[PDB]
Symmetry: D2
Subunit: 143 residues, 4 copies
């Protein structure tokens, strides 16, 4: 059952790279998680003010998963759908889907989970309110 | 801490492989990036299939497609720590196989991370599922 | 600062391609890792050869082997900065081609890095050098 | 002209990974520079006391190059030869070569150059003496 574009709120284009393709010629399964990491964090920096260089609070990835429906290959143009399934105190569950640009049905769809912690000590903390506001803005309307 | 799932132990896995860490395994927060673990899963599984199951990745008529995967991360590791992957097969079907994997520090019992993934085996050119080849089945059966 | 070589300028390159940065482009010191630049060179060149020169990477009988490369790094960039690669062909021979590339911030004139690499074109199966195919030559000639 | 094993002083085995192979089936050219980065830094940490997590001094890569003589593929076992061509005040030139384990003639050979700087400001500084001692120990005897 394949996610559709209209089921996500925010989109990030990601350009494909030569070595995204593996030996069998399609984007390797691993690379999809790099797209997930890149899509989520691009948004938290651009919209939630996240300071990756010097911020006191960082997101740890505690879990992730992906289902792969149909392949894509460098150099096809792809775009990530991003939404938030649940925003908790200090953790957040994201759902994502990769689409060919100019296509309705996702090639792959996944999820991952951030827990926000103090940079040095890794103690869980309140999502800075700026980040909270941006995360809530991605709230899934799916079903 | 991180994932709250029950942490698997070394003795739950049947085969082990060391994987050296690389400089850029670490990301900007200083530990091995979450994505990298899936590259360890891919490496551990295919190393085995080739060396023990005879898989021919260069000219073989049959290939593994990864159709789902997942991982829980319990505690960080960092380059240049030496790591090792535990592998077992949780199920072995006609055309598909589910692996369980965990990363351990070399010289240690509790998993830093654990996850799974599914291969479906298909004809190289057409991508029509075929049955897992006999020699590869035999090798996978030894991990179940 | 870093490399002391003369910094190339945008107008020295003939074709440009934006490449989005990815989370793990940054390494533990916080900027895009030196290795990543070569992945940008590979991407910029092959994107062009496919889109403009008709190269068929999936089923083509002729492939590019990278036989040498180099890079000078003048100043850092960091994910999520938007970057772009300038490309020109410095020489175009019968079977080999030398590219010059530089990375720029999108919206900027001075190169953050610059380097080169050489393709030799070979028969896919045997790796015997063949001449660069006519359609690919024509595209490369437009960058020289 | 292909470097031989006996022309290097220190060796690091590096295990190959699935996605090291690209679409044409051999380790991608880019990956060799990751091997260079990994070999040099493994040694500076293990033998020169480098503190990558919290050290005040970091190495910047200002230049690199590689010549590729013959291919290798996952899952072949490979090993990096490492030597120092010239140790300067604040910079150092490394030469490296990739060998198949159990083979004399290098598949590829390269060089790269570190400039050591203050972590925050990137001002060039004296190589901490511990690092200096380890770097001198790799001095090339080649010719």
């Amino acid at each position: 059952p394949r996610p559709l574009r209209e089921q996500y709120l925010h989109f990030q284009p990601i350009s494909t790279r030569w070595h995204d393709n593996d030996i069998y010629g399609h984007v390797n399964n691993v690379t999809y998680y790099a797209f997930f990491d890149t899509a989520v964090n691009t948004y938290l920096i651009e919209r939630g003010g996240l300071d990756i260089q010097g911020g006191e609070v960082i997101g740890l990835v505690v879990s992730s998963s992906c289902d792969y429906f149909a392949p894509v290959a460098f150099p096809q143009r792809i775009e990530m759908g991003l939404r938030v399934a649940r925003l908790g105190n200090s953790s957040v569950q994201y759902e994502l889907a990769l689409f060919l640009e100019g296509q309705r049905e996702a090639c792959a769809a996944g999820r991952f989970v951030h827990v926000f912690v103090e940079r040095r000590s890794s103690r869980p903390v309140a999502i800075p309110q700026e980040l909270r506001d941006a995360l809530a803005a991605l709230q899934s309307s799916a079903q």
